Amino acid sequence: DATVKLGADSGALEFVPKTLTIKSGETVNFVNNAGFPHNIVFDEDAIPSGVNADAISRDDYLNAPGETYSVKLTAAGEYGYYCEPHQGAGMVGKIIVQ
Ligand SMILES: [Cu+2]
């Protein structure tokens, strides 16, 4: 399992780390750090076919400080995802599942 802080302590709205590599079946914990509310809307494109992004997409917004979203990715492949509220600011990421 690996943990992604949503936003740096400085206030910058970025996925930390932006490019994360995990193994098949590892859980990603997206812990709110700064800039909340945040959400994780996996992109339908640039992903394993079948639009699995929607099922693993966080439509709701994490608002409480330290709120953690835990998602298990078993399918191998890059997952290109982005934070909608800060999508224009470049708050995106990619999770290589092997
Ligand atoms: Cu954000």
Author numbering: 1 to 98
Could you pull the original sentences from the published paper?
Being a multi-subunit complex, its macromolecular organization affects the dynamics of photosynthetic membranes. A chloroplast photosystem I (PSI) of green algae consists of a core complex and three antenna modules: inner belt, outer belt and Lhca2-Lhca9 heterodimer, which together comprise 24 subunits.
The thylakoid membranes were solubilized with n-dodecyl-α-D-maltoside (α-DDM), followed by affinity purification, crosslinking via the chemically activated electron donor plastocyanin (Pc) and sucrose density gradient centrifugation. Signal subtraction, followed by focused 3D classification, allowed us to rigid body fit a model for Pc into the density at a local resolution of ~3.5 Å. In C. reinhardtii, the negatively charged residues of the Pc acidic patch are shifted by ~5 Å owing to the missing residues P58–E59, and therefore, the interaction with K101 of PsaF is weakened. Instead, the binding strength is compensated with the PsaF region K78–K92, which has six lysines (78, 81, 82, 85, 89 and 92) increasing a positively charged concentration at a distal site, thus supporting additional electrostatic interactions with the acidic residues of Pc.
